[model samples]
Target: SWSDLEQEVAQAAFQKAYEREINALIQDVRDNAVQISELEDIWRLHNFLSAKRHEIDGKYDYNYSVLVFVFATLIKQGWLHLDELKGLDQDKLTKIGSLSRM
Candidate 1:
């Protein structure tokens, strides 16, 4: 049931959220690099991003059948805020948004 427009919204959501995460992560690294002892915190942040990358990389799917669950899961997890999914169609929004509600 997916059309080209839905795919565009999906991709845009992914791009918007992923870029936001990247920006925050980059700033975090800069903030934590201020001291030599900060290696402790730096290592911790590195570990987080390492594991986070794998999960984020694995979850997104462009396929409509697969994407409903994939995007729903991310929205629930806060990777993609519900607001970013705004351009998506109504039914798609309901399915994804509801999944995050309970």
Candidate 2:
């Protein structure tokens, strides 16, 4: 349940993040996606965004809330096994505090 909600919220947040000022980022990603030569640049851009993207985390908590909705949905849908999610001893989310360092 939580995982489904998390995924949905993550996707929504990603979309909102893209809407924010990712035009240049999108263009770069698109070009890179289209050609092998642009791959390195794409990776660099991805890394850069991965590192800096959380600056907006505080600005979009509702969008983040939407993520929990998905985890809830997945559990409701039964696509994801509850046991596996529960079985994880360490939580990736607990480690998310360092997302900026990604």
Candidate 3:
């Protein structure tokens, strides 16, 4: 059980990363880099976002075991930075870096 570390900073760190990703997603879509009439393009946009929404929901977690792996994956995906996870145990930090390397 991840029933230790009563400090709430860990939770904040994870949330910050999550927020950063959402902001980027918003900014990317705001550019309107489309003709607005390509039906398949619009459909594929929805499809990609839908897939990632599900993936993100499944990826972020309160459990450090699950969360650490998710962070590593996010780092590799450019959605998160390794330093954003500071204040966590150094062990977890190392694991995140190593895991991010494929």
Candidate 4:
């Protein structure tokens, strides 16, 4: 009975760590999304330019990186199953890929 209790406690601790990691990743993305949105406000105050497009793209890429981490965490948690995703048709997969770019 003691050993069973130890195992359960270990499992619960591990799960809490996993949840914290996921929450951190989600918060990272949420903050980045807000930061990116503020860029538009900056542009509205100061004229936007084609030359600055690269800078905007760089900021968006940061957002993408955080989102990718969220997706990776979800997959690792079995919250998102790739085997189930494999059942999707090519067109759907392509659409998903396109959405990832944004």
Candidate 5:
């Protein structure tokens, strides 16, 4: 069981691993110099690129680490409370799997 301190450390590492990508995204937005309306779409595009980076080959191991970090982060953040994760029916599980991909 990961204690709260371990979870905090893991989340910090996760952010560090993605810091470069985050910086690049920020730089791209600044370089383009767009209004908030345009910036909104740009943010979505950045999110897409970040999410799909794992499928591009290379850094596969690191990507897996990041994915695990995300899972852990969600639990720590109360977004995936373990207490509420039990006793799901097949249909509920299926729905969860489908939604999780997005």
Candidate 6:
């Protein structure tokens, strides 16, 4: 039942999107003090955090940090209720952080 599988995925994506929004909001508040130390210092923090987690920690400015946390938070919360709209977009949610670079 591939159709059912797609339905399940799509449903999950949607739920993920919603959870992304919520957790991003919460993380925004949760990470207030985890501040980047300095705008330029974020690069080092990104590298350090990534090395420990063995994942590219993305650009570590405030927003990117939040994006990473929110993404993981959504995953932990379960994708069953998420919106499947994410469909492999690496930059799907971090646009906010990208803009801040300018």
For this target, which candidate reaches the highest lDDT against the unseen true structure? 1
User: Highest TM-score among the candidates is held by which one?
Assistant: 3
lDDT by residue (1-102, candidate 4, tens digit) is 124443454344335445665576568556655666566755643443343354434422323325334333434554443343343444544544454444
Q: Each model's TM-score?
A: 0.71, 0.29, 0.74, 0.32, 0.30, 0.26
Better of 5 and 6 by lDDT: 5
The RMSD (Cα, Å) of candidate 6 is: 13.8
Candidate 2 has an lDDT of 0.47
True lDDT of residue 18, candidate 2: 39
State how far residue 28 of model 3 sits from its true place (Å).
2.8
- Please give the RMSD to the true structure for each candidate, in Å: 2.7, 14.1, 2.7, 15.2, 13.4, 13.8
lDDT of 3 by residue, 48-81 (tens): 7788789877878767557767778889988778
Model 5: residues >4 Å from true position, as ranges?
A: 34-102
Q: On a 0 to 100 scale, what is the lDDT of residue 4 in model 2? A: 62
Order of models, best TM-score first? 3, 1, 4, 5, 2, 6
Model 6 lDDT per residue over 7-45, tens place = 454445545565565566567545743775777766766
Worst 10 residues of 4 by lDDT: 56-65
Cα miss at 73, model 4 (Å)? 16
Winner by lDDT between candidate 4 and candidate 2: 2
| Off by more than 4 A, model 1 | 36-43
Assess candidate 5 and give its TM-score to the true structure: 0.30
Query: What's the residue-level lDDT of 34 in candidate 4?
Result: 60
Model 1: weakest 10-residue lDDT segment is 30-39
Off by more than 4 A, model 2: 23-90
Order the numbered candidates by lDDT, best leading. Answer: 1, 3, 5, 2, 6, 4
Candidate 4 achieves a global lDDT of: 0.44
